[PDB]
Design a protein around this ligand. Sequence first.
Ligand SMILES: O=C(O)CNC(=O)C(=O)O
Ligand SMILES: [Mg+2]
Ligand code: NI
Ligand SMILES: [Zn+2]
Length: 331
Amino acid sequence: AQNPNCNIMIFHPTKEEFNDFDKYIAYMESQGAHRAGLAKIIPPKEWKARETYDNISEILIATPLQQVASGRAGVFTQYHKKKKAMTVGEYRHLANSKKYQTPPHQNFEDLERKYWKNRIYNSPIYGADISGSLFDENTKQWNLGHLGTIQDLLEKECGVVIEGVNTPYLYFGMWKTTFAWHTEDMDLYSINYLHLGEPKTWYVVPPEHGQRLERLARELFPGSSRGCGAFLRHKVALISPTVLKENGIPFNRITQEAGEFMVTFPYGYHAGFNHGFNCAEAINFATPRWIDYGKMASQCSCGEARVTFSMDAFVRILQPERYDLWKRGQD
Ligand SMILES: O=C(O)CNC(=O)C(=O)O
Ligand SMILES: [Mg+2]
Ligand code: NI
Ligand SMILES: [Zn+2]
């Protein structure tokens, strides 16, 4: 069995290996990369996403979100307060202001210590889930707007044609912006490219151990757990590495830098934070190996999770027994 300790693997594809996306995902899996829940892919030196980032300032962040925390430094929830619209140039200036800028630090480990000590005492502002792409149309390799769609994958594997679309999303971050513990919708894969700026630190639980994280979360967030049998789908709960280690939960950590891709694998729980002003692009995707995970994915039906149009068909076809309850939670 490849990668039996479930370590995060780092890959360096050549330009020839970078041509065929599906083939390379399958290669990484042949080496056991999915056992970690997360892998890093460093593009060949010949590749670029686009020519420059000099002309992105006029992109609009229609609904910036202020992430307000409640709890204790290592075990907290966050809610998102909507703010007035602003451009990427305005948001960059805000991220660099004395109130929001990254503090002085020695190295990534010192900054990680500072994040977990101090996060709750501040409310950073995140531009999230902005439909769009920063890949040049002429970039033919690993262009996150030109991937095979999940609807086409389901149709290829199962024979059923379904409605829905699959497009990428942009994220603009600042110091302390936070992504809560979650798996993807329908336990899909994700891919994330860090286009520019400061790093992103990730934490991940191996898929084979995801239910250990779920049981700890029910203990640590007991009101939320009574409210909903899949409350991590709400994407609001944070648990620090120190608390995970105290409770024996298997996990790993890695820092992504600009120019690097990360892939999350089906049912890989992940969380993390941004180091300073940055911009990332991410999208969900599927492979044949995903179908079994889609069939078994938990679902929130309490009303909180609310998701895209295209998840309807995935539930309806893969989880017909659950469909009527889930759709009620959508309405
Ligand atoms: O970068 C972010 O804020 C969140 N991204 C992801 O959860 C992802 O790519 O799966
Ligand atoms: Mg612009
Ligand atoms: Ni994710
Ligand atoms: Zn719920």
